[PDB]
């Protein structure tokens, strides 16, 4: 009675969306309906392709009259299961209702019941005991062929549920649907453009719609092309009407759609703002103010970022893939960590020392089948989806199992890593930086000779033994971090001294160190083979330790006014504490 | 949260599939944006298109309080949707939307709250605001590609250090009144 809705009547008032294109798909349905056997068609497809619009659009075509004479007289009906089950409290309510509706179909002989999500009725209508499901009830009538119906289901649902019921499948004739071509999509948007133009009181340009389909497929990877494009067109109109001005930008021009796709995809948009331009230009020295030396490494990171934001970048690869190798204590990781801070983007860290076993690597791409925990999905896929624009740090990659390489090989080549669940992660805007200590032993090794020789060349051979040529060939660059020079150490000392002052500022203590004392700390702690970590120990032994005793129990409870200076006679620093 | 709200309102103003889905980790403030929208409305600092709009929060427990008989849950759920469709100036904030996937089902019944809400979401008659964590959205909500397609995901990101202090200052009077205390500026930082 009220469960069924006459789609044709809805078409008269314009509620139904007019179907555009899909001429071939329509033919198959009409042909299936007309044949003697297998009268019921099944529109299999994917979510958003437009399988429902075809059925709803078929009725619209019938009222318009652009269909064969045989189908012109037909009246398509649509069943709402929720209304059918709303009042089926007593015994026999569902059976009498469904059976009553079926009688109407057979007497007419020309109506079609378009039921979407046909898989749902497989187990619906029978709570327990009776087991009188709608699928079983309709089955006999389908055998004769008196009633013809149209179904809709997805591939996964059809195989998992619908295929199980061989009886129903035998009656229905499967139809394979696929997303339309980009050429067909633009025509669909133009046909549907008046509907959205009136609702939003805006005029969409023909150039903008073409950009929407092209830009959406390039960045939006979680939906099919027809619905995906419409989502960018509907939001665009919504954005324009919400402007504070009284619809000044009535027309939807180009470069406005770019904002919507960028916002939906959570990626940087084109026409970079002055703030971003200043941030990228200023990021030539700001990194050099925290990581001294290794200028060639910083340039590689900034160029990849500058290229991608400029618009010149790899079509399917990431912004950049780098392998940071070198001696201990150099800024292989610090330069990466400070990069994320300078850019204001989340830093994704992955200590590869925990992924040294094959079972653990399976957790990155997805979750093991055995686990029944609801927290499925991989650690790397989930993180990337949460922060598409981010820095991915794979520290000590050499420790990880070789299987990890198979994951990165498809990332640097394709840019996407599908998880076990099926979610699609885009690595286009994510920076890829992996550090390693392959050949580090050679760097600290001393030769058997009067002159110590440079074992950097030999260390590279070890890197070529762990990382296959295909892996290195896909890397954008393979940077080698040079050893810290004496001049550089003086800059490193100032960096640690500043950090010390910050810690002291929280306690209201001020520290002033003479240049002579700073130079003395460098000569004691300078070790080319052991990088800059030894310098930290020197700062702890000569500056932190004398003050820790004074801070806890001493004059330096508050105020500070400390003064450190060198004693040339004994080459030892003299500490002066003021109680303030 | 001016940027996040601007997108949520944009989604709600859409002709079709005007159902936002505020996603983010726990504590970011996803429920602060849904409930906050109401507070922002009553204050009067909102676009005229959103004014006079009513936001209703759904309690799934109350919905299934007495749905013992067959079809009772379907009637109650459908009755609520009819009210939203009739007014055309109301929204339904469903928190923990992963729960509505399977709410009322038979021994083998595929029918659930998601199947009933699905047709009206696509039509656009009713607007629905969702809020769920990243873990639940990817392992529960994203499994049903049909229900997710209708919802427009909005990623709520953790705020910066400076943004949070402003939030505490905004909420400082409420907490101060409950404890009859005063918080200094140094404490917040």
């Amino acid at each position: 009675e009220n469960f069924t809705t006459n789609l044709n009547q809805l078409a008269r008032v314009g509620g139904i969306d007019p179907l555009i294109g899909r001429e071939k798909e329509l033919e198959r349905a009409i042909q299936v309906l007309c044949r003697r056997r297998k009268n019921n068609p099944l529109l299999v497809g994917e979510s958003g392709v437009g399988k429902t619009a075809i059925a709803e659009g078929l009725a619209w075509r019938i009222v318009q009259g652009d269909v064969p004479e045989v189908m012109a007289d037909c009246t398509i009906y649509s069943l709402d299961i929720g209304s059918l089950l709303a009042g089926t409290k007593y015994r026999g309510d569902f059976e009498k209702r469904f059976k009553a509706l079926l009688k109407q179909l057979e007497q007419d002989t020309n109506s079609i019941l378009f039921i979407d999500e046909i898989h749902t009725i497989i187990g619906a209508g029978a709570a327990s005991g009776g087991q009188v499901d709608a699928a079983n009830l309709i089955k006999p009538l389908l055998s004769s062929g008196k009633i013809r119906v149209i179904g809709s289901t997805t591939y996964q649902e059809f195989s998992n549920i619908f295929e199980k019921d061989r009886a129903l499948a035998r009656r229905f004739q499967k139809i394979d649907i696929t997303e339309p071509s980009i050429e067909e999509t633009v025509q669909i948007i133009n046909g549907l453009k008046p509907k959205y133009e009136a609702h939003h009181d805006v005029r969409y340009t023909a150039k903008a719609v073409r950009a929407a389909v092209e830009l959406a497929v390039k960045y939006i990877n979680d939906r099919h092309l027809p619905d995906k494009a419409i989502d960018v067109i509907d939001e665009a109109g919504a954005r324009a009407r919400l402007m504070p001005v009284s619809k000044r930008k009535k027309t939807v021009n180009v470069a406005d759609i770019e904002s919507v796709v960028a916002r939906i995809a959570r990626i940087p948009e084109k026409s970079v703002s002055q703030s971003d331009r200043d941030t990228l230009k200023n990021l030539g020295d700001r990194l050099k103010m925290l990581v001294f030396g290794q200028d060639k490494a910083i340039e590689a990171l900034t160029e990849a970022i500058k290229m991608a934001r400029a618009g010149l970048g790899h079509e399917h690869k990431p912004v950049g893939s780098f392998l940071f190798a070198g001696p201990t204590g150099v800024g292989k990781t610090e330069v990466t960590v400070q990069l994320s801070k300078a850019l204001g983007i989340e830093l994704l860290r992955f200590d590869m020392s925990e992924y040294m076993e094959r079972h653990t690597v399976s957790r990155l791409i997805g979750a093991p089948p055995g686990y029944v925990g609801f927290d499925q999905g991989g650690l790397l896929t989930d993180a990337v989806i949460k922060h598409p624009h981010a820095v991915l740090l794979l520290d000590e990659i050499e420790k990880a199992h070789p299987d990890v390489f198979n994951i990165l090989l498809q990332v640097m080549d394709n840019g996407t890593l599908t998880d076990n669940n099926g979610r699609k992660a885009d690595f286009r805007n994510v920076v890829l930086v992996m550090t390693t200590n392959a050949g580090v032993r050679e760097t600290e090794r001393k030769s058997i000779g009067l002159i110590h020789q440079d074992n950097s060349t030999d260390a590279m051979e070890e890197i070529k033994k762990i990382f296959t040529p295909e892996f290195r060939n896909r890397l954008d660059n393979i940077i080698w971090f040079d050893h810290l020079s004496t001049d550089v150490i003086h800059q490193v000392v100032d960096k640690f001294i500043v950090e010390l002052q910050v810690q002291l500022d929280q306690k209201g203590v001020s520290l002033e160190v003479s240049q002579e004392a700073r130079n003395w700390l460098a000569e004691k702690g300078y070790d080319r083979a052991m990088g800059a970590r030894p310098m930290a120990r020197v700062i702890q032994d000569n500056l932190k330790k004398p003050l820790a005793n004074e801070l806890l129990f001493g004059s330096l409870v508050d105020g500070g006014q400390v003064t450190v200076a060198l004693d040339k006679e004994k080459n030892e620093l003299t500490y002066g504490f003021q109680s303030a | 949260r001016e940027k996040e709200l601007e997108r949520a309102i944009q989604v709600l103003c859409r002709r079709r599939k005007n159902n936002p889905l505020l996603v983010g980790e726990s504590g970011v403030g996803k429920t602060a944006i849904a409930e906050g929208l109401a507070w922002r409305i009553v204050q009067g600092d909102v676009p005229e298109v959103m004014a006079d709009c009513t936001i209703y929060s759904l309690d799934i427990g109350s919905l299934l309080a007495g749905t013992k008989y067959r079809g009772d849950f379907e009637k109650r759920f459908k009755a609520l949707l009819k009210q939203l469709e009739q007014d055309t100036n109301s929204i339904l904030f469903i928190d923990e939307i992963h729960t509505i996937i399977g709410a009322g089902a038979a021994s083998g019944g595929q029918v659930d709250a998601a199947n009933l809400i699905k047709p009206l979401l696509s039509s656009g008659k009713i607007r629905v605001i969702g809020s769920t964590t990243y873990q639940e959205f990817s392992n529960i909500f994203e499994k049903d590609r049909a229900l997710a397609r209708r919802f427009q995901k909005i990623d709520i990101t953790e705020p910066s250090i400076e943004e949070t202090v402003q939030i505490i200052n905004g909420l400082k009077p409420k907490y101060e009144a409950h404890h009859d205390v005063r918080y200094t500026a140094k404490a917040v930082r």
Partner: peptide
Amino acid sequence: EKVRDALKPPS
């Protein structure tokens, strides 16, 4: 497993 059954009272 743990399945919920909806009863039907007689008319």
